Design a protein around this ligand. Sequence first.
Ligand SMILES: [Cl-]
Ligand SMILES: [Cl-]
Ligand SMILES: [Cl-]
Ligand SMILES: [Mg+2]
Ligand SMILES: [Mg+2]
Lengths: 228, 233
Amino acid sequence: GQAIQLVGFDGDDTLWKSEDYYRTAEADFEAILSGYLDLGDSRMQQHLLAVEFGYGAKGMTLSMIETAIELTEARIEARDIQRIVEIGRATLQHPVEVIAGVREAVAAIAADYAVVLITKGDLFHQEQKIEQSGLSDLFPRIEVVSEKDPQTYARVLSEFDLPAERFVMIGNSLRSDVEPVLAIGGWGIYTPYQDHGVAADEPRLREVPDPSGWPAAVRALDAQAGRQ
Amino acid sequence: GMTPIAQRDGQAIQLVGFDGDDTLWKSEDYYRTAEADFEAILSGYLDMQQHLLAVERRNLKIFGYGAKGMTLSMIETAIELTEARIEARDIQRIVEIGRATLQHPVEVIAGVREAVAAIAADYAVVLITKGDLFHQEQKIEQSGLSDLFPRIEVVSEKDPQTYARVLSEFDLPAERFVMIGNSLRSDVEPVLAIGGWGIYTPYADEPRLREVPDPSGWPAAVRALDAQAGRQQ
Ligand SMILES: [Cl-]
Ligand SMILES: [Cl-]
Ligand SMILES: [Cl-]
Ligand SMILES: [Mg+2]
Ligand SMILES: [Mg+2]
């Protein structure tokens, strides 16, 4: 006898660090290009954007490769393309660091609510991050998906036989973690770490600055769902 | 995530799993084309070559299966084979091979749709495949067979533990599951290992397996396996 029954959690940049490592890869990529191009010139013009193979580490590497070949008019040396491959390989072999307060927060939540990890990305690398994280033991239901759109979240909830009104999703993206869930009648917790359509006065949302606030926020949303 | 199958009385097998690549649709043809285009690029450097297995075997452990990792392993192999002589323009060409493979035409194999529909009349059906989730999802949509495969399960590896996990979610014991595929090693052997049944259809002994040369034989094979299963349980 309670309103919210299930709490979902994003992976990358919610449960564990990810973007930091992609920023390191990007820094290394630009260092390679700086041997060929004047990158201190508002004039380049990437457009890594255009070459997205995907947004995961494999897609990033192929995109970095195409970009480098394009921007250097195919003058880039094979030895330096090998260095871009080593960036992706290094990014793929990154043990993920769990975000401080996350294990405590999930444990506290898992004491009163069912939980599910819903992560979009490369299946292989995401399974590796889940394993590396040590968080498997708190998540008996784990979903890796190719897209976070309303229908994918709906499909997930349909497998739990649970209406969206009894679900809270926690994530670092208003666009891909909160908005789609609101769209099907759910609740969100946003912990920031792609314009989105979330209304400035959205009542079914809390912004929680760090994971230590997630349990209180779930309970707050649960009381609201009970009154509403 | 799979959800428990409604099991029917009066039959023993309840669920039939299908592989995709080289079972429901053509795949290997396109990978062989990829490999011949790769060799054609290399031919301008060297008098394929099989430094490629070396590289792919070590990269499996970071990429898993699929065309994206294949492309990166090809780049790495070409740079090795040509002692870093390979032109960026030709590496460009390797990336295009990979791009082409990632959108390869999905041509369903003769007789498959009728076989699947026939089986689906009496049994739950699931598509179980390893590799790239996004690419495998796109192949089922390109194929035209989406209406028959609402249940779709992409895994990182096809091994007994994985198959057992999939079945645990359907809440089904392995003796009520048949798996159909073209690879003995990946499709059939791991399912036999956890106590299931197998149909082996290679893409051009063992009482719980049938070797069936083409898909038109699959529905009869399922029925025969079901009959055997029922006499034992
Ligand atoms: Cl990717
Ligand atoms: Cl990913
Ligand atoms: Cl694949
Ligand atoms: Mg995230
Ligand atoms: Mg196959």
